Nucleic acid binder design. Structure first.
Ligand SMILES: [Co+3]
Ligand SMILES: [Co+3]
Lengths: 248, 248
DNA sequence: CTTAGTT
DNA sequence: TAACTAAG
DNA sequence: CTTAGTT
DNA sequence: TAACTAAG
């Protein structure tokens, strides 16, 4: 009943997330930056047809909305022999002011894992970035032209490929789990963007903790993949390392 | 009468030099080195004809002599639209043990020039290397095949292109002028392989010094170019620098 | 002649 | 990874 | 589509 | 100074 007991925590049975606690972000520009409008490349009818179902959803979910901006970047058809929209935000990235990296690199992250905690739970957050709202004055930065034969659509949430997206989500989630960290000082919580690791002393403290977290997460607005989940094992796969009794 | 007063000091009127004080050198090998015999490349009759007059002289002067060695390197025709023998000692160089560089680089050499000494004399030594005898056990290293349609000829003096030749001549001449340096402490003598610089306080001390040196050199066995000579000036050309009142 | 070393 | 030079 | 960066 | 890749 791991799934039944926490409906709002899993993407499979929680719909879509929304970090309600987090104010919509602004994307500060470089003092030199001016809009760039890149024309849309043509696109096979098949490609454009495989991309419509995504543009349709995110439009109903209010993640995409129409707009009218001087910023415009191209959209892409990419093949898993299926299609999925991919925006080319490289020219926008060049113009966005950089932020200080806070995401610790995986090695130093795992350093702070006491060997005493041998009961692991691993969760990846589903559509992590969309959980973070964009402030309207920043939304025009990622507009893109769309048409199924027109005009511009942009994002209302932190988008795929925005160079600062992983750092910003990290700062957001660390903020939002600050409480949890305090409510459960016997547990060890590891944070790398969207991938989490919870380690405990006993299989008791692990399950009880995995519930406290899965509840904390659903309420706060994020969603985890019930598929790729790994609940209360002594052996889990976190950020490419294998964890078997404290090794790797 | 600069020329008349010192016949044995100038190559023009002193024939050929011979550092009589210096024992014939040995060329120590690398512990790994074994002879290499490189076959002679063909050679236009014109080239070979322009090279015969040199091979003829150095044979009469006893600088070249016949021999029979496992070492053999190629001889070269080079164009000044005239010919002059040039040996390719590169493969022998690879096999000769290196020696510690003692030749100071020109910058640091000129550093020790007191501005008080503004009266210069500059001399280049003619056929410097041939003034140094080779020990017979080392001579076979630079053999080369010669024929005016055969067999090997080698050198009895330090040869053109031997990688250690300039350092060895420097050590030799510094040795041989150690006395002079002491006999004339008011003069400044500068040594770079074959190019010398003598600087003095007065034009008196310069001329008197240039005589003491030109005599010291002739007796010891070296010869200077009376052509390219520069005697008692306040402005001379030494190792590419211009010396005008202590500048450069 | 070959070749050590160069955007 | 495409010759080109100066030097023996 | 483009393009940052690689013996 | 000859493309070739992965990534947006
Ligand atoms: Co160059
Ligand atoms: Co690679």
């Amino acid at each position: 009943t791991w799934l039944s007991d926490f409906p709002q925590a899993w993407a499979e049975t929680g719909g879509m997330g929304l970090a309600v606690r987090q104010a919509p972000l602004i994307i500060p520009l470089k003092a030199t930056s001016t809009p760039v409008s890149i024309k849309q490349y043509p696109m096979s009818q098949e490609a454009r047809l495989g991309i419509k179902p995504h543009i349709q959803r995110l439009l109903d979910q209010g993640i995409l909305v129409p707009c009218q901006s001087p910023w415009n970047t191209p959209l892409l058809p990419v093949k898993t022999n299926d299609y999925r929209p991919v925006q080319d935000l490289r020219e926008v990235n060049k113009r966005v002011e950089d932020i200080h990296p806070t995401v610790p690199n995986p090695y130093n992250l795992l350093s702070g894992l006491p060997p005493s905690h041998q009961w692991y739970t691993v969760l990846d957050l589903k559509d992590a970035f969309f959980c973070l709202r964009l402030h309207p004055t920043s939304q025009p930065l990622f507009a893109f032209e769309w048409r199924d034969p027109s005009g511009q659509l942009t994002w209302t949430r932190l988008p795929q490929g925005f160079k600062n997206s992983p750092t910003l989500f990290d700062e957001a989630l660390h903020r939002d789990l600050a409480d949890f960290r305090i409510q459960h000082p016997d547990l060890i919580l590891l944070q790398y963007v969207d991938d989490l690791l919870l380690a405990a002393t006993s299989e008791l403290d692990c399950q009880q903790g995995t519930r406290a977290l899965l509840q904390t997460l659903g309420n706060l607005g994020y969603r985890a993949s019930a598929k790729k989940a790994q609940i209360c094992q002594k052996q889990v796969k976190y950020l490419g390392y294998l964890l078997k009794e404290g090794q790797r």
